[PDB]
């Protein structure tokens, strides 16, 4: 997918995203919500998408108490047959925010 550069951003920050090859590892990601879509980027300058979600199909869930995941407050959004994404916000405040906002593209 390709990002507008016009376009209002609703959310943009880090993340830590675990990787898919199943030694389940995590990458700190540059993550942009834009429309409906999430965009991710190798840092904070914004150049070049690496990784994108159209949302609309997705359900995003917190992952809930206890670090299952090893690390706190992260959260999942997945759709059968589609890539999962799992990720791990720094903060409540973060994982707040980041909730809210996939819940609305989403819905």
């Given at each position: 997918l390709r990002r507008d550069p016009n376009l209002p951003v609703h959310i943009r920050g880090w993340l830590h995203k675990q990787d898919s090859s199943?030694?389940?590892?995590?990458?700190?990601?540059w993550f942009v919500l834009s429309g409906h879509?999430?965009?991710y980027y190798k840092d904070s300058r914004e150049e070049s998408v690496l990784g994108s979600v159209l949302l609309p199909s997705?359900?995003?869930?917190?992952?809930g108490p206890g670090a299952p995941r090893g690390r706190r407050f992260t959260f999942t959004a997945e759709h059968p047959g589609m890539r999962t994404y799992v990720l791990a916000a720094d903060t409540?405040?973060?994982?707040?925010?980041?909730?809210?906002?996939?819940?609305?593209?989403?819905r």
């Open positions: 199943g030694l389940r590892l995590w990458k700190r990601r879509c999430l965009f997705y359900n995003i869930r917190p992952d409540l405040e973060d994982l707040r925010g980041w909730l809210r906002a996939l819940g609305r593209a989403s």
